[PDB]
Structure 1
Amino acid sequence: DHMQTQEIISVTLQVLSLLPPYRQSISVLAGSTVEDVLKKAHELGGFTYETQASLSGPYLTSVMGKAAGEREFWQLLRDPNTPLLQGIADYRPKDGETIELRLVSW
């Protein structure tokens, strides 16, 4: 007989490395991971991605039908131009953040 409460936050998910680009505000509970944001964007319709289960956890391999090729990867960043220091299953965005998926070659 007591109330609990959680914070709903909004994370902007953006992909500028594709034609057409993707940019959508995604609502999730605070504590959701980037992977949960991608799952919600896919549920909403209009976002697709793939992952593979590496020995380090979920590794993002494809975004909106573009799989990273040889010596390419999908880099995770927050605005402004700040690479994330954790992967999709561990980074927990904050309200108002913009998460960018960027195709990068090394």
Structure 2
Amino acid sequence: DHMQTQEIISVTLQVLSLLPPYRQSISVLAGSTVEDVLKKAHELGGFTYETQASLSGPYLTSVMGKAAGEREFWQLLRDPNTPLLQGIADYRPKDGETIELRLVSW
């Protein structure tokens, strides 16, 4: 009886680089980008983030109040432990995906 035609999908968003960690299932419209997931998570309450505009599209600079500093970046991953090959405005997760934001240093 539930919708199985995927007009609405659900994507788990997780951030484990912070204490306390964040993990929530976020429902969004089909075809949503990662950025749409971040927007929804913020709208629902209990999540925040910031981006910076660029010629390559929005770049994720801060997650849950923690801004990336020198030689750090917020990395985007899908299951299993696989970094995305597109940014937040271009990657469109599949229904049931888990997107992780991970603070990585080089």
TM-score by length of 2: 0.94
Q: How far off its partner does 1:3 sit?
A: 15
- Whole-Å separation in 2 of the counterparts to 1:48 and 1:85: 23
Identity in percent: 100
Moved beyond 4 Å, runs of 4+: 1-6
Cα deviations by residue, 1:45-92 (Å, 9 ceiling, x for unpaired): 000000000121100000000000000000000011000000000000
| Equivalent residues, number | 106
Q: Give the 3-state SS of the residue equivalent to 2:27 in structure 1.
A: strand
- Whole-Å separation in 2 of the counterparts to 1:4 and 1:96: 12
**C-alpha RMSD over aligned residues:** 3.4
Cα deviations by residue, 1:3-58 (Å, 9 ceiling, x for unpaired): 99861110000000000000000001110000000000000000000000012110
CA contact (8 A) 2:76 2:100 kept: yes
Unmatched 5+ residue regions in structure 2? none
Q: How far off its partner does 1:94 sit?
A: 0.4
Counterpart position of 2:65: 65
Larger Rg: 1
CA contact (8 A) 2:6 2:95 kept: no
Unmatched 5+ residue regions in structure 1? none
TM-score by length of 1: 0.94
Q: How far off its partner does 1:2 sit?
A: 22
- Whole-Å separation in 2 of the counterparts to 1:72 and 1:12: 24
